[PDB]
A paper describes a structure:
While sequence analysis suggests that LsrF will function as a class I aldolase and genetic data suggests LsrF is involved in P-AI-2 processing, the details of the role LsrF plays in processing P-AI-2 are not known. To begin addressing this question, we have determined the crystal structure of LsrF, alone and in complex with the P-AI-2 analogues ribose-5-phosphate and ribulose-5-phosphate. LsrF crystallizes as a decamer with each monomer having an (αβ)8-barrel fold, a ubiquitous fold commonly seen in proteins catalyzing aldolase reactions.
In a departure from the typical (αβ)8-barrel fold, the first β-strand of the LsrF barrel does not start until residue 51. Instead, the first 25 residues of the chain extend away from the barrel and pack against other subunits in a form of domain swapping previously unseen in aldolases. Monomers stacked on top of each other have extensive interactions that are significantly enhanced by a ‘swapping’ of N-terminal residues. In this swap, residues 10–24 extend away from the (αβ)8-barrel formed by their chain and pack into the interface between two adjacent monomers in the other pentamer, burying 460 Å2, or 21% of the accessible surface area of this swapped coil. When all of the interfaces are considered, approximately 40% of the total surface area is buried in oligomer formation, suggesting that the decamer is likely the predominant form of LsrF in vivo. Consistent with this conclusion, only decamers were observed in gel filtration experiments (data not shown). A single water was built in the binding site of unliganded LsrF; this water is displaced upon ligand binding. This asparate is structurally conserved in LsrF (Asp57) and is well positioned to participate in catalysis as a general acid/base. Rather, there is an aspartate (251) located only 2.9 Å from the K203, though on the other side of the lysine from the catalytic glutamate in rabbit FBP aldolase.
Numbering used by the authors:
A (entry chain Q), B (entry chain N), C (entry chain M), D (entry chain R), E (entry chain P), F (entry chain L), ...: 10 to 176, 182 to 290
The structure:
Amino acid sequence: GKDFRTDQPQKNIPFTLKGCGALDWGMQSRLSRIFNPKTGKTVMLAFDHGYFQGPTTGLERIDINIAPLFEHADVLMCTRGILRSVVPPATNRPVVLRASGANSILAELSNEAVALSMDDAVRLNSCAVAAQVYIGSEYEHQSIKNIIQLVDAGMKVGMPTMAVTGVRDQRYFSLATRIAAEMGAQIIKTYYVEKGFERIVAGCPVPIVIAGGKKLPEREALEMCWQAIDQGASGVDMGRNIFQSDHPVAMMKAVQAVVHHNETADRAYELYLSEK
Amino acid sequence: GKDFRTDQPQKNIPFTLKGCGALDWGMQSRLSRIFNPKTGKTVMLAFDHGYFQGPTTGLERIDINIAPLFEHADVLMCTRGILRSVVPPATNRPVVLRASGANSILAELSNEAVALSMDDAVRLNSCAVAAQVYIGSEYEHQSIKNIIQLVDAGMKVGMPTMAVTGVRDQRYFSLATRIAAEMGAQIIKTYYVEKGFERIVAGCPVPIVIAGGKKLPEREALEMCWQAIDQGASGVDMGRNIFQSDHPVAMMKAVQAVVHHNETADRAYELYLSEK
Amino acid sequence: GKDFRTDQPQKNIPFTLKGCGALDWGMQSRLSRIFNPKTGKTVMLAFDHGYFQGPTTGLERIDINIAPLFEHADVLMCTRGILRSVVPPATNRPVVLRASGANSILAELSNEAVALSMDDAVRLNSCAVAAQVYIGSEYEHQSIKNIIQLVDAGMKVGMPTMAVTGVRDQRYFSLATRIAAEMGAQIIKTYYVEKGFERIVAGCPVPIVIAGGKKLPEREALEMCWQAIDQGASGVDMGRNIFQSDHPVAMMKAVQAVVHHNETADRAYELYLSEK
Amino acid sequence: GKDFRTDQPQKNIPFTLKGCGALDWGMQSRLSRIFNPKTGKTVMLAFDHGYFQGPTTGLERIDINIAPLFEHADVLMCTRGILRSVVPPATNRPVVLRASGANSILAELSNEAVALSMDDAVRLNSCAVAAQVYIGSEYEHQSIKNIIQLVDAGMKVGMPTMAVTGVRDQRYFSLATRIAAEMGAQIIKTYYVEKGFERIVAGCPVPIVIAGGKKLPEREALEMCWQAIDQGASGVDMGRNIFQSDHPVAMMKAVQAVVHHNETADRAYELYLSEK
Amino acid sequence: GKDFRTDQPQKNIPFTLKGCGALDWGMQSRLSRIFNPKTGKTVMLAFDHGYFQGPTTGLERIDINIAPLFEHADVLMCTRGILRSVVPPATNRPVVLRASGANSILAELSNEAVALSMDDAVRLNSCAVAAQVYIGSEYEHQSIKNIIQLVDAGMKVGMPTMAVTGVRDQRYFSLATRIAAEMGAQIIKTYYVEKGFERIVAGCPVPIVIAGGKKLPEREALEMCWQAIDQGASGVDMGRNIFQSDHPVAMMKAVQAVVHHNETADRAYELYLSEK
Amino acid sequence: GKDFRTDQPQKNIPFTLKGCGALDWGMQSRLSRIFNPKTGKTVMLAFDHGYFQGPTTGLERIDINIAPLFEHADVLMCTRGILRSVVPPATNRPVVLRASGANSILAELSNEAVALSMDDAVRLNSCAVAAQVYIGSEYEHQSIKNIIQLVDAGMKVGMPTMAVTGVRDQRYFSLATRIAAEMGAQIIKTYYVEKGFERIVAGCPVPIVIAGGKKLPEREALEMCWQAIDQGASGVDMGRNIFQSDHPVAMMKAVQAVVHHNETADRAYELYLSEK
Amino acid sequence: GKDFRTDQPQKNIPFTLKGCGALDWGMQSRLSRIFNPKTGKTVMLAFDHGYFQGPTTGLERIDINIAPLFEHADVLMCTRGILRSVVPPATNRPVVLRASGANSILAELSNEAVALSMDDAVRLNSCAVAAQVYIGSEYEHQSIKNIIQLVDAGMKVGMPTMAVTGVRDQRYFSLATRIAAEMGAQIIKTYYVEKGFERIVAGCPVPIVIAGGKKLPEREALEMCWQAIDQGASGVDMGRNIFQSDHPVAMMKAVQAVVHHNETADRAYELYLSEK
């Protein structure tokens, strides 16, 4: 009375996430937490700037200002320090730990070191670890070494590594993104570019996520989102453009719309206003 | 132009999951994946029986039969072998890896050993590892040693351990659950008991999940669920009672209702029929 | 304008705790948490019996029954499982982790293995780790090996080891306590003996703590306490005799008095009744 | 005849210490040794200055001058060298080991390295390890790296890390404290600021303890204490302001009062005089 | 009824690959994948330039441009990043992983560090790992240290190391190739030289492979190939000269012919045109 | 004005201790602590019997009975437990730690395991570690494995191993001593034999020390000592025959005389009486 | 003025030793010490029997009896105990360390365990390590495991492993030798067989050395040697047949002759008598 369904042969489900087709199950799993499998994209709420900047504006009180924001994000990005202290475990959202540091705004910006062991990143159940790479800066060599070291460790343990390009035109980000990706980073985070972003994406063999940069009027930020996605980015991280907006949650739903659901910039903006 | 909100002092968000208030962030995180923070409960779809049983009925083809079932479960439980081969990473559901094995239905049932390294469990992004404890059986000592070893390893790494009690009355399950919990297991999985289940829960300091046992008519299984939850269980795993039902998905929604939403057995059953 | 007080030469303060004069600072420190430096004694509240016994009477609900008891104890003794789940860290009392297990009341009692890694004992900030030795029982060899192994590990890390003698006359406890001590245990926990206890203490080169055994009427337990201390024991652990008493806290103050303050059994009992 | 109290369901005791709600039992335990659970605060007697300063005034003879002081402190802070040699283990007080060093007052102050292994810290039963971070100084990068490394090690083992900010206004200590905390330090030690201290506390997600700085007249030091506490500090360390006072013990009870008991500066001072 | 063929004595098959006669079986095996045992030569398709160059011309899209090229190569050479993301495992071709990096075209070229652990190289089933040595450049010391370290690791594990000489006459390449070989590299990759290439090969005790350098008209590249082989090279890597040619596949068959089959430059070229 | 004394060539001082001529400096040093370089012999005061025997007669109180005895011994032999608790470090005598145990007089005698890690032996500054071998007993295999393991460890670290033969004629001790020595033990401890002791010594390639065995009248013990030495033993250990004598110190001087100074039994005995 | 001899191409010298053509340089080097490269054979003087036998006849005093014998042997075989104590390092002969033991002639012969770490073998500069395999005996499983373990370790380090077959006809030694070889042993040592030895050799893919067995009259031992060599053995070990002969040295020259130089048995014997 057992059925092996011999007439129907087992078939492998493809993993479509860009450039992550050859990864072990655990690694693909972590990535799948970050990038929605249906849409292949992610909305990331990153608040890690304290790491070299101290209490930046809008990050003065993560526990109050940002805590309400978590639910509307696909993935969180912060330091391990902040995570343990003021991010509730029950927040139940995937995190990308920031794992570079040891610079200040008072000194050379590119002077970064690995800021936590994979050991602890694994201890914290991270979906990925992130570090900054600084092509063209004084400590560009150490920066890449940082990525390298994170990838060596991540590979033993199934932890993806995200390389963030710290700094301004396409040719440049192409170099920076590509080198990072090539070194082994599974996720690249970078900036949007008004001319030639497509080349950047096309040249990168792994998913790209874009950082928001300085605060803009929402309408403009959304347009940037819309453009980035339209041009093949896999996620957007609006930092300042979110936690700094007077209507954060509204903004996020805007961003969710552009990213996952395809809304056009205008509609997006409108529900932006809708949700105030 | 910065606001530290000095008038409002940072306050710690309590972690209410039973007996899990003193765990590092990562461990609390993994547990939060398993047990819903809002309701403090879980619906678990366990298909690990192949481990000593081979192609048991209804588990003949996980890839076909059970694959459709994943989305309606809070947490999956299977072997690492099965997980890699036929569970799609994109399934994006938390897994509890079954980590004991080396027994057959052809020999002594309690003769189990640890069946994978924490190393690999971590590599596979598990939310927990599970092993069987066999109080009263011939290899009861090894079984506990197994739990012990998994907890020693999990604590290095933030991985919770689930001890499952393999075997029939309350006093008995009390002993078995309690010893396991006392050894260190963060989650206990065990069987429902018509008389005295409350004592079992009350005496266990950590979350309890119940296994379904042999297939029953749905109405009866739901009643069992309803009872277990009403009596303080933190989740239910209906194995056979689900994958074997002619209308699996419908059953799961039934179970979701009882567990998370509080529906009474009858209503539950009714949407059971509703969903066919 | 600096004073080195050359006329007054630095002198070493002796460490008087019995048999612990040649230990490193950290180990001496942990022992000092357990045994009061002024009186050289400890009142221990041990509730670890669940470890092979399940929900023994009075330990049904540690979180409710025993939780109120902590403050009146010098040192707590429990399993790591119970400690993490239901002992509040803020309890701020030194713990001795029970580190043997894998036996049941359903099987041979002496069949114990080491139940946690020093690694985790250290992670849990223990003052000491404890295991049972079973001279004359079937698994007496393993039991000693367990002590040995715990001492090998504790020495790397500054962790004292407590050997408990599980089982009935003096000559016997002498053999057992002495072997344990000799193997390397810093603390011996054992049973009181109506004839010859003095020889037991005298023959042990390290501190002895006595377990209470089965519940007695308080008057009788106190007398036993009084006798044990009078005869050179360094501490008492009244398990059942405390958590099972109808007036626990009162009992503890009774015990405190006998142990630290020297009250005679009768006075002790009287404030026993006083404190109800 | 057993009572599981089923009518009464086990509930988790919150851990209220600021930013320490997501830590494993052991680490929470160590912290609870330092910061009183009832008041959430600590009085710290730090005499570690020898580390780069040699026999500073008042620290000429720890063994004579400071030894009497121990009992009136919540936590001690010294080097491992001093601890072993002249702090009696029986002192029975929690210690925070100073773990940075390799600088002299004869050379660049910020040139510090890690000055002991976590291995030894654990061997010494520390409640935490401390190192200095030097934002703005020449070796600011190494200083952070030192914190990072101590956190990486401490997390393996349950050991909290204290970052002390070495150097003068709020905006500055905000940057320094926040980066350290963000890197992962569980305790921040810093200086009081007459304007804007609240922002410093508000911006730090973990407990802050303030250093006394140069000796002041007691009345003034108390006011500083009072102000620090009133403004949200979790502890105070009056170094010079204590061991250098002509009436040390009296001062401490003054500080105890302000810190734990809430006395107003004036009353505090008065029992200061009272206790001479 | 068994035949041991005693009349015929077992004889050892020689391993003829240059300078690889004293290697363990596994190492010999990996080399045998790379260099054809019959002809003792290899045709290598290297696309690792992204590593310090970003999306160089013709490497813009490995996945599209180069993917078709794989089947006609003996061995592939790329970074671990590119390999995982866009090289299909089923490509079933031996790879030599590029294992140096951390330089940019924006900074000193010779500033390279080891860019992956042997650990991961082994995890990726590599046939060899490669790094650049830079005699005469600013970071020539680190470069050799790099080779050293890879050989140290590769020897533990059976992994050959390729040293590539980055930079122009014979005497020079002799120095560079020889030092690398001498340090321990099993494969040397270097440039062709119009005068004195013979001395270069003759002085190297291990196989040499030549890099193509800047794109040339095919006829000329083939002549270079032909010459290199004729003068004792063991393989050629035409990078640009292949992926940049308008007729890549045709080129490779050209190169295959010269290398393995001995065709003269002219015939080679002709089938070059033939295969368009 | 420097003199290299070229006319006088550096010459190597031989190391004459039997069978120890090919040992590294550290190991030769430790052995030199035990066996006097001038006479090549040792007087050993062993009190380790508590290890399986409990408080044997005369070892009831090491701290009182045996403490006076240390100064008159070349080397001490006890457990690590006893050593830490009641042997003063300032005793300044070399120790041979007893490193086997886990047996009781209540069970099979030969059932021993390694009783402490070389790690701790080294931590205790031992001159050697000792374990028992039991040829012909039930656990003879494990006993030899014990010796093997200690040697494996000791060789990493410069620690000599002493194998004691536990049990009755020459042919027998020859087998036992020789196997142990052959396995790798640097020192053999064994019993004296009235016929054929010479063959035992002659067949052992490394130093032999003899155990006293049951208490005898001093005159007879001395004669045994005298005979053992006369027949080539390298040391004697009179356990019972010393600590049990009514005039211990006198006895030791007797033994010193026979062993190091060559006194004849009678003279020896006489100063025995002399020294009462 | 440099000559690279381009006209003459580097060629690989074959390594002809049987079944050792695919080993790393170091391993081939150690084997080359044992087996003469010219003749591909070895004369081994083995005196390791003390290991389970005690002072066997003729091994009573290695230092005297056997010491003279070393120079006339190609390779020595003894225990590590004996080697350190009584084999002079200056003996300058290759040794094969006996690495199994823990049996006695008083108990089951096949009960052997690994008797030293590869770590020490390497420390002693061994050419190989040897252990016994016991097909058909009670502990045959452990015996093979022993070989396995040694090979695992030896391969890390370049150390060949010799398996000796302990026990009587061809079919039998075929099984035994072949299994050992197959497991991974590089050298097999076994007994000569009057019928079918050829099959044994032919069936073994690696060098075979024969043990002499019980003492025979020289003429007969020589004939055995001659026959073994004639039938394809790669070396002989005459233990007893040498150290027990009245004219040892003469015997060895006899054996040398048969083995390396091809002398016929008779001539061999004659120079046997010649050399007395």
